[PDB]
């Protein structure tokens, strides 16, 4: 009954209680744990136990007391019907899973036994539904095929039953408890349809009944907001219908397929029309109806397509009717997020048809649709009018953005039908979009939507119109929204530009307004893709940019990208002008920093910006800049002291340093680095990050000394209290080794430096694995794994390996079964493997000695299973996954 | 943790057009693939099963292509531009290089490029087998 | 979840396939459940296998029968993991 404490804090504690559900006493304590008058909290745990045990430990069951188990479960169900809900349901499912096992009549007597009045039926239904799903996971020690086969033999009973119940209810009074039971009923069926398969030919009966059930839920509310009960029941009716057509086998039943689809259509049309009304009462019903149609077409592509061309009359009409519903669905009014939740449904559908026809006349037959659709999209591509002034919540706005993404993708797709034709329609809608603002200048929605539609196709005369239109549009007159789109749509057309002069005009202009970031992105795109072309305007932009930065109005965050465009523009500058521009554009950044160098949390920010700005400008300017860095190297030392205690600023400065250092390889920089790093070291994670980066580009003295200092300093930090600090040291432990690992593969002759103290390295490396960080353990491991690799090639290093030989594999086996979390076990099979390829013989012995000849690789694991795992581990040197399997099994058997 | 995300891109924007091969694995298991060849733009999309996401990950974790960096690497050049963006859990990466035995050696870290260009093949081969069956054809 | 039919039929994604595993091995335990429309066993860095295969069955009855019956298979030493290759949505 200790589980109670856990219910107030389930998450941070489980493990105990769970394994207790595994022990055979679980059977004895469950029924006692869920007695009368006891807390529902533990009673649910009493129920989950019996359940898990019935599916997981049927192996620990006495065939002699089989029926007892049932009678046992039947009594509880009786006690809990009316008591706690969650429990009853759990008991019901327990009764079901029980039955699953008896399959190899049971399903027929279960039904008979149950065919309070109301409750009784709930029990039965819940019981029968839980059956096909348990059989899906329940371990019956029986081949799956026969467990499926047995159940598939009683489907008709299930449905025919439900189908019988429903109709029976179609004549009586629909009690609240009646809807609910009818829900279970309809859901029961559905579950059996997706889990077990039945011929569509026998689903026509129920299909029709459910249909009328739906109707009986929708039409009384029309005169259309229905109770949740009617809605839940409706959905479930609909979902089951979906499950009915989607079946995998149905596709070959062109006959039942048409029949059912025709009845779905001719019976659901009305409801669709009524909800397409603007007085929204249920958006729920229409999504499922529209969903069902869209889906039923997916499952039967051939019927739909063949109806188009082979044109069986019955099909040409059906198909057109099915598409009209979906087309309507797509064209449905309102913004996707707020007014009509069916837009996604329709977009999903077109994708299928468009790809299905591309994978005949169907292409031409789809053109009209495709064309019409495109228009609809742009229509839905229209952002919410500020009339509603976004009375919506960002959720909706955030989701709309996602929506638009799917809507622009759909655009793309239809572009594949008409490479240029789509361009025509978009133009047409833009011309109208012209007559929209023309008559009513408040129609920016249609302007932004139209523009948006064009940008949507920017990934492939109609086009330039767009450009001109953008120039003509007086963006300062309409809502800020147009400026952001206009600019963004232009950025996407970077390629088509390679019309550039006005592009600049727009971007620079777009910077003036609220939406700077947008213009920023647009600019950066242009700079990256058509640099040569902007050379004439490089002198201009570069200077126009420096000015735009002056106002503090521009966001620093965004201002950084402008720095990117600048650096890219500078490249296209003349000899004379470059440095002066750099001076005019870089000096401020350093001096600002310098001022702060005077010597706070408010200063930390300014420090970061200036540092990143350079970092960026450098990044793009690496496409020289050496003189700039030469006279700068000293200030990074200074910034480090200010930032000695703040990694944030630290990382910021290093990045800057790194990006500029990149230019040197392609040499005076190396000197201040050892100076800048000698100040940094004087042991956060970024610090070693650069040391490695610097080192890896120098593949001799400059590098060896920095690495040697690099190792010896790390130890000092690593020298903190092993117990806590080491745990606390997770970040640096991962990093340090991650770097010493990368430095190994490249810069290999490095392992050559006899100077390096490896015994020390490994000393700590074996600890990290045994660390408390969830992932840093891979680094230590990864490191060791790559040392053993090179170690087999250098006697010098081999020594270290020989000594650390049995020690490592020991450290590995300790974590793998006693110290390393259950999940991070596989990360060790790397070192165990690296040791078999270079030292198979040695590893074969260090393994037997630590596993077969130890008192306790673990106390629980069996000497037998221990000896065999030890054998497999040493035999597999060609597979790492295998190791992970042999490793894991033992890992389990080890911890118990 | 659900942060898995993979993407790739390799194409040249010459005067003759933008040839390319760029596919992407979305978090929800959506595999969009696009490729325009000039011996035509073949769009493709599909939701790969959980397990496929797992394999993409496994291949990535064993290639240790998450440690490497394009810092010393050859940036994109007139001839080409390769992109790789992987994210697994709380670690996100994205690389930039040009398309391509000697060119890789002459690069700062040939071992860096060798791993990168080696994973790409491991991913290329997968996304191709995936598509090559769902739609009956690879790119030529 | 939710399997997806492919142009050629239904496909499964077999994971945990031995590294030395050849088309013959996979083609040995997957033909017993139906006439596989196609098969696929993806090598790299001279490694004979990549650990996975796209087994395709004309039907879905066979695909599932296999998916369930071949889930714990232990070929060439390692156990395998058979899953539906393509699902139909997130």
Strand partners, B91: B88
Listed residue (A458, A470, A468, A474) closest to A423, CA to CA = A458
Quickly count: other Cβ atoms within 10 Å of residue A600's Cβ. Answer: 9
Q: Give the C-alpha separation, A72 to A570, whole Å.
A: 83
- Which residues have CB under 8 Å from A408's CB, separation 6+? A381, A452, A455, A456
Phi first, then psi, for residue B137 (nearest 5°) are: -170, 140
Q: Give the C-alpha separation, B56 to B53, whole Å.
A: 5
- DSSP codes, A844-878: HHHHHHHHTSSS-S-SSS-HHHHHHHHHHHHH-SS
DSSP H stretches of helix in A598-684: 601-621, 626-630, 633-642, 647-665, 669-680
Contact B31, B134 (CB under 8 A): no
Best to test chain A binding among B64, B76, B98, B133 (most A CBs inside 10 Å)? B64
Give the domains, in start order, of chain C with CATH numbers. 1-90 (3.30.70.330)
Write down the domain spans for chain A. 1-896
Collapsing DSSP states into helix, strand and coil, what is residue B41? strand
Contact A590, A635 (CB under 8 A): yes
* DSSP code for A826: G
Beta strands C86-87 and C74-75 are unpaired
Cα dist from A368 to A35, A327, A374, A408, whole Å: 68, 12, 10, 19
Q: Give the C-alpha separation, A452 to A458, whole Å.
A: 10
Collapsing DSSP states into helix, strand and coil, what is residue A175? coil
Element containing residue A406 per DSSP (H, E): helix A394-415
CA distance C68 to chain A (A): 6
Cα dist from A85 to A91, B104, C89, whole Å: 10, 67, 33
A881 touches chain C (CB under 8 A): yes
DSSP H stretches of helix in A440-555: 445-456, 462-472, 480-492, 494-497, 500-512, 516-529, 531-550
Contact B23, B34 (CB under 8 A): yes
Rounded-to-10 torsion of CA A571, A574, A576, A577: -60
Collapsing DSSP states into helix, strand and coil, what is residue A183? helix
- Which residues have CB under 8 Å from C18's CB, separation 6+? A879, A882, C25, C49, C51, C75, C76, C77, C78
Chain position carrying tokens 């496909």: C11
Q: Give the C-alpha separation, A442 to A496, whole Å.
A: 30
Instruction: Extract the tokens encoding B10.
Output: 């390799």
Give the number of beta-carbon pairs within 8 Å between B and C: 75
- DSSP codes, A721-786: -TTTHHHHTHHHHHHHHHHHHHHHHSSGGGGG-TTS-HHHHHHHHHHHHTSS-SSHHHHHHHHHHH
**Distance, C-alpha A743 to centroid of its chain:** 33
Element containing residue C9 per DSSP (H, E): strand C9-15
**Distance, C-alpha B22 to centroid of its chain:** 7
- Which residues have CB under 8 Å from A5's CB, separation 6+? none
Chain position carrying tokens 């390996």: A801
* DSSP code for C87: E
Phi first, then psi, for residue A342 (nearest 5°) are: -95, 0
Side-chain half-sphere CA neighbours of A88 within 13 A:
16
Element containing residue B91 per DSSP (H, E): strand B91-97
Q: Looking at the partner chain, which of B18, B71, B110 has a beta carbon nearest the beta carbon of A658?
A: B71
- Which residues have CB under 8 Å from A748's CB, separation 6+? A790
Cα dist from A586 to A143, A597, A624, whole Å: 74, 17, 14
C-alpha radius of gyration, chain C, whole number: 13
Element containing residue B97 per DSSP (H, E): strand B91-97
User: What is the sign of the dihedral through the CA atoms of A200, A203, A205 and A209?
Assistant: negative
User: What is the sign of the dihedral through the CA atoms of A833, A837, A840 and A842?
Assistant: negative
Best to test chain A binding among C64, C80, C82 (most A CBs inside 10 Å)? C64
Quickly count: other Cβ atoms within 10 Å of residue A451's Cβ. Answer: 24
- Residue in chain B closest to A699 (alpha carbons) equals B108
Q: Give the C-alpha separation, A438 to A434, whole Å.
A: 6
Q: Give the C-alpha separation, A778 to A760, whole Å.
A: 19
Q: Give the C-alpha separation, A891 to A861, whole Å.
A: 9
* DSSP code for B77: B
Element containing residue B42 per DSSP (H, E): strand B41-44
Q: Give the C-alpha separation, A302 to A252, whole Å.
A: 10
- Chains contacting C with at least 3 CB pairs below 8 Å? A, B
Contact B11, B18 (CB under 8 A): yes
Collapsing DSSP states into helix, strand and coil, what is residue A385? coil
- Which residues have CB under 8 Å from A291's CB, separation 6+? A238, A242, A345
- Which residues have CB under 8 Å from A616's CB, separation 6+? A560, A561, A563, A564, A567, A659
Instruction: Extract the tokens encoding A633.
Output: 């190297």
Strand partners, C14: C53, C82
Q: Looking at the partner chain, which of C51, C52, C86 has a beta carbon nearest the beta carbon of B134?
A: C86
Instruction: Extract the tokens encoding A530.
Output: 């058509």
**Distance, C-alpha A701 to centroid of its chain:** 47
CA distance C67 to chain B (A): 13
Q: Give the C-alpha separation, A428 to A51, whole Å.
A: 64
Chain position carrying tokens 């399903």: A107
Enclosing domain of residue B3: 1-140
- Chain length of chain C: 90
Collapsing DSSP states into helix, strand and coil, what is residue A280? coil
CA angle, A59 as apex, A57 and A65 as ends, to 5°?
95
Q: Give the C-alpha separation, A81 to A781, whole Å.
A: 56
* DSSP code for B7: E
Strand partners, C87: B47, C3
Beta strands C74-75 and B4-14 are unpaired
- Chain length of chain B: 140
- Which residues have CB under 8 Å from A863's CB, separation 6+? A852
Task: Annotate C27-83 with three-state secondary structure.
Answer: HHHCCCCCCCCECCECCECCECCCCCEEEEECCCHHHHHHHHHCCCCEECCEECEEE
Contact B30, B109 (CB under 8 A): no
- Which residues have CB under 8 Å from A302's CB, separation 6+? A251, A254
Instruction: Extract the tokens encoding A623.
Output: 């496409």
Beta strands B47-48 and B41-44 are unpaired
C-alpha radius of gyration, chain A, whole number: 36
CATH architecture of A1-896: Alpha Horseshoe (1.25)
Q: Give the C-alpha separation, A674 to A555, whole Å.
A: 35
Side-chain half-sphere CA neighbours of A260 within 13 A:
35
Q: Give the C-alpha separation, A546 to A538, whole Å.
A: 12
What burial class does residue A62 get, using C-beta atoms within 10 Å of its C-beta: 0-12 exposed, 13-18 middle, 19+ buried?
A: exposed
CA angle, A288 as apex, A283 and A294 as ends, to 5°?
120
Listed residue (A661, A613, A611) closest to A636, CA to CA = A611
**Distance, C-alpha B98 to centroid of its chain:** 13
- Chain A contact set for C3 (CB, 8 A): 248
Instruction: Extract the tokens encoding A747.
Output: 């810069």
**Distance, C-alpha A443 to centroid of its chain:** 37
Q: Give the C-alpha separation, A237 to A243, whole Å.
A: 10
Instruction: Extract the tokens encoding A732.
Output: 């640096």
CATH number at residue B23: 3.30.1560.10
**Distance, C-alpha A806 to centroid of its chain:** 42
Q: Give the C-alpha separation, A528 to A2, whole Å.
A: 64
Contact B37, B128 (CB under 8 A): no
Quickly count: other Cβ atoms within 10 Å of residue A107's Cβ. Answer: 22
Listed residue (A728, A738, A741) closest to A771, CA to CA = A728
CA distance A716 to chain B (A): 25
To one decimal, the resolution in angstroms is 3.3
Strand ordering across the sheet containing B17-25: B41-44, B31-36, B17-25, B4-14, B82-88, B91-97
- Which residues have CB under 8 Å from A330's CB, separation 6+? A342, A343, A346, A347, A349, A350, A373, A376, A377, A380
A790 touches chain B (CB under 8 A): no
Quickly count: other Cβ atoms within 10 Å of residue A533's Cβ. Answer: 13
Quickly count: other Cβ atoms within 10 Å of residue B122's Cβ. Answer: 21
Phi first, then psi, for residue C40 (nearest 5°) are: -155, 125
CA distance C38 to chain A (A): 18
Q: Give the C-alpha separation, A659 to A652, whole Å.
A: 11
Q: Give the C-alpha separation, A414 to A454, whole Å.
A: 13
Q: Contacts for A215-224 with beta carbons within 8 Å, 24 or more apart?
A: A215/A267, A215/A271, A216/A170, A216/A174, A218/A271, A218/A282, A218/A285, A221/A281, A221/A282, A222/A274, A222/A281, A224/A274, A224/A275, A224/A277, A224/A279, A224/A281, A224/A282
Contact A51, A35 (CB under 8 A): no
Contact A337, A400 (CB under 8 A): yes
Q: Give the C-alpha separation, B57 to B43, whole Å.
A: 24
- DSSP codes, A464-493: HHHHHHHHHS-TTTS-HHHHHHHHHHHHHT
Q: Taking each helix axis from N to C terminus, what angle separates A284-299 and A343-358, rounded to the nearest 10 degrees?
A: 10
Q: Taking each helix axis from N to C terminus, what angle separates A577-597 and A531-550, rounded to the nearest 10 degrees?
A: 30
Q: Give the C-alpha separation, A789 to A839, whole Å.
A: 10
Q: Give the C-alpha separation, A168 to A702, whole Å.
A: 90
Collapsing DSSP states into helix, strand and coil, what is residue A219? coil
Listed residue (A395, A479, A469, A463) closest to A432, CA to CA = A469
Phi first, then psi, for residue B68 (nearest 5°) are: -55, 165
Per-residue exposure over A490-517, b if at least 16 CB sit within 10 Å of its own CB, e if not: bbbbbbebbeeeebbebbbbbbbbebbb
Strand partners, B84: B8, B95
C78 touches chain B (CB under 8 A): no
Phi first, then psi, for residue B5 (nearest 5°) are: -165, 125
Phi first, then psi, for residue B94 (nearest 5°) are: -160, 125
Instruction: Extract the tokens encoding A95.
Output: 């009764």
Q: Give the C-alpha separation, A821 to A350, whole Å.
A: 48
Q: Give the C-alpha separation, A83 to A77, whole Å.
A: 10
DSSP H stretches of helix in A81-227: 85-101, 106-113, 117-137, 144-152, 155-169, 176-195, 203-218
- Residue in chain B closest to A660 (alpha carbons) equals B71
Q: Give the C-alpha separation, A783 to A827, whole Å.
A: 12
Q: Give the C-alpha separation, A87 to A90, whole Å.
A: 5
- Which residues have CB under 8 Å from B34's CB, separation 6+? B20, B22, B23, B41, B42, B43, B44
Phi first, then psi, for residue B32 (nearest 5°) are: -85, 140
Q: Looking at the partner chain, which of A412, A662, A745 has a beta carbon nearest the beta carbon of B71?
A: A662
Listed residue (A92, A103, A160) closest to A127, CA to CA = A92
Q: Which residues 231-260 of chain A have a CB within 8 Å of chain C? A: 248-249, 251
User: What is the sign of the dihedral through the CA atoms of A223, A224, A230 and A234?
Assistant: positive
Chain position carrying tokens 């993991």: C81
Contact A620, A567 (CB under 8 A): yes
- Chain length of chain A: 896
Number of independent structural domains in chain B: 1
Contact A418, A370 (CB under 8 A): yes
* DSSP code for A389: T
Side-chain half-sphere CA neighbours of B6 within 13 A:
27
Collapsing DSSP states into helix, strand and coil, what is residue A576? coil
């Amino acid at each position: 009954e200790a589980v109670v404490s856990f219910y107030r804090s389930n998450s941070q504690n489980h493990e105990w209680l769970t394994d207790a559900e595994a022990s055979p006493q679980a059977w004895q304590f469950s029924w006692q744990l869920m007695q009368l008058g006891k807390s529902q909290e533990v009673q649910f745990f009493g129920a989950i136990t019996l359940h898990s045990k019935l599916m997981k430990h049927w192996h620990e069951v006495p065939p002699e007391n089989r029926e007892e188990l049932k009678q046992k479960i039947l009594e509880s169900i009786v006690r809990f019907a009316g008591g706690p809900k969650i429990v009853l349901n759990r008991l019901c499912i327990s009764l079901g899973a029980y039955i699953v096992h008896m399959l190899g009549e049971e399903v027929i007597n279960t039904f008979q036994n149950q065919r309070s009045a109301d409750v009784q039926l709930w029990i039965m239904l819940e019981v029968l539904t839980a059956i096909p799903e348990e059989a899906q996971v329940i371990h019956t020690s029986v081949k799956r095929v026969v467990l499926r086969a047995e159940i598939a033999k009683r489907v008709q009973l299930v449905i025919h039953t439900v189908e019988r119940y429903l109709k029976l209810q179609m004549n009586r009074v629909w009690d609240a408890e009646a809807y609910s039971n009818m829900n279970r009923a309809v859901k029961c069926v559905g579950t059996w349809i997706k889990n077990i398969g039945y011929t569509i030919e026998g689903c026509v009966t129920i299909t029709a009944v459910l249909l009328e059930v739906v109707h009986k839920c929708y039409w009384p509310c029309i005169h259309g907001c229905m109770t949740a009960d009617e809605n839940e029941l409706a959905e479930s009716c609909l979902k089951t219908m979906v499950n009915i057509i989607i079946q995998p086998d149905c596709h070959n039943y062109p006959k039942t397929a048409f029949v059912l689809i025709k009845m779905f259509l001719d019976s659901l049309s009305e409801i669709t029309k009524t909800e397409w009304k603007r007085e929204n009462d249920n958006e729920d019903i229409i999504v499922h109806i529209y969903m069902l149609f869209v889906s039923s077409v997916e499952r039967h592509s051939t019927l739909l397509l063949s109806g188009i061309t082979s044109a069986d009359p019955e099909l040409s009409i059906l198909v057109h009717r099915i598409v009209q519903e979906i087309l309507h669905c797509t064209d449905k009014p309102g913004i996707y997020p707020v007014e009509e939740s069916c837009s996604t449904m329709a977009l999903a559908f077109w994708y299928m048809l468009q790809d299905e026809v591309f994978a005949h006349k169907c292409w031409e037959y789809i053109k009209p649709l495709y064309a019409h659709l495109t228009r609809i999209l742009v229509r839905k591509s229209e952002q919410p009018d500020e009339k509603s002034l976004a009375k919506w919540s960002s959720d909706d706005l955030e989701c709309f953005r996602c929506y638009r993404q799917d809507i622009s993708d759909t655009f793309m797709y239809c572009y594949d039908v008409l490479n240029d034709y789509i361009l025509e329609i978009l133009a047409a809608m833009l011309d109208e979009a012209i007559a929209d603002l023309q008559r009513h200048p408040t129609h920016w929605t249609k302007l932004e939507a139209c523009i948006y539609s064009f940008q949507s196709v920017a990934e492939h005369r109609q086009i330039p119109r767009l450009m001109r239109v953008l120039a003509e549009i007086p963006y300062e007159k309409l809502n800020v929204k147009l400026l952001g789109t206009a600019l963004e749509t232009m950025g996407s057309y970077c390629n088509w530009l390679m019309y550039i002069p006005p592009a600049i005009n727009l971007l620079v202009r777009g910077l003036n307004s609220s939406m700077s970031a947008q213009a920023t992105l647009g600019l950066k795109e242009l700079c990256r893709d058509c640099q040569l072309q902007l050379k004439p305007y490089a002198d201009p932009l570069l200077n126009a940019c420096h000015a735009s930065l002056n106002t503090g109005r521009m966001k620093n965050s965004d201002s950084v990208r402008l720095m990117f465009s600048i650096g890219k523009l500078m490249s296209l500058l003349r000899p004379e002008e470059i440095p002066k521009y750099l001076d005019i554009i870089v000096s401020p950044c350093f001096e600002e920093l310098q001022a702060i160098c005077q010597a706070t949390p408010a200063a930390r920010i300014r420090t970061i910006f200036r540092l990143n700005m350079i970092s960026t400008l450098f990044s793009s300017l690496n496409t020289p800049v050496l003189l700039v860095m030469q006279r700068t190297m000293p200030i990074f030392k200074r910034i480090a002291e200010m930032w000695v205690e703040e990694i944030d600023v630290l990382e910021a400065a290093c990045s800057a340093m790194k990006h500029a250092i990149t230019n040197l390889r392609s040499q005076p920089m190396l000197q201040d680095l050892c100076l800048f790093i000698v100040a940094s070291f004087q042991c956060c994670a970024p610090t070693l990050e650069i040391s490695k980066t610097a080192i890896v580009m120098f593949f001799k003295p400059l590098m060896q000394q920095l690495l040697r200092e690099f190792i010896q300093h790390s130890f000092k930090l690593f020298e903190s209290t092993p117990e806590q600090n080491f745990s606390n040291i997770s970040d640096t432990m991962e990093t340090f080794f991650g770097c010493l690992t990368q430095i190994i593969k490249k810069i290999p002759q490095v392992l050559e430096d006899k100077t390096l103290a490896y015994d020390r390295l490994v000393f700590y490396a074996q600890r990290g694995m045994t660390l408390p960080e969830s992932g840093a353990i891979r680094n230590s491991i990864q490191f060791l794994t790559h040392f053993v690799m090179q170690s087999r090639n250098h006697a010098h290093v081999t020594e270290v390996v020989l000594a650390t030989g049995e020690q490592t594999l020991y450290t590995a086996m300790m974590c793998v079964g006693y110290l390393t979390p259950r999940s991070q076990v596989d990360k060790f099979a790397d070192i165990l493997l690296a040791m078999n390829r270079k030292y198979a013989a040695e590893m074969a012995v260090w393994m037997k000695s630590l596993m077969s000849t130890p008192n306790f690789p673990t106390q629980l694991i069996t000497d037998a299973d221990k000896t065999r795992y030890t054998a497999l581990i040493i035999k597999e040197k060609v597979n790492k996954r295998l190791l992970q399997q042999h490793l894991s099994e033992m890992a389990m058997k080890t911890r118990g | 943790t659900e942060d898995f995300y993979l993407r790739y891109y390799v194409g040249h924007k010459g005067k003759f057009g933008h040839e390319f091969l760029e596919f992407e694995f979305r978090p929800d298991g959506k595999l969009r693939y696009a490729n325009n060849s000039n011996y035509t733009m073949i769009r493709k999309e599909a939701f790969v099963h959980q397990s496929v996401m797992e394999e993409l990950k496994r291949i990535i974790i064993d290639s240790e292509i998450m440690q490497e960096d394009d810092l010393p690497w050859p940036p994109p050049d007139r001839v080409g531009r390769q992109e790789l963006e992987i994210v697994i859990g709380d670690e996100h990466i994205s690389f930039t290089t040009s398309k391509t035995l000697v060119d890789v050696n002459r690069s700062k870290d040939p071992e860096g490029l060798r791993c990168f260009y080696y994973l790409v093949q491991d991913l290329k081969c997968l996304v191709f087998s995936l598509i090559g069956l769902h739609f009956k054809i690879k790119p030529i | 979840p939710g399997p997806q039919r492919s142009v050629e039929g239904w496909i499964l994604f077999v994971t945990s396939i031995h590294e030395e595993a050849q088309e013959d091995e996979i083609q040995e335990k997957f033909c017993d459940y139906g006439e596989i429309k196609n098969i696929h066993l993806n090598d790299r860095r001279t490694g004979f296998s990549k650990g996975y295969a796209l087994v395709e069955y004309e039907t879905h009855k066979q695909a599932l029968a296999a998916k369930e019956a071949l889930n714990g298979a232990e070929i060439m030493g390692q156990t395998i993991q058979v899953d539906w290759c393509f699902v139909k949505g997130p």
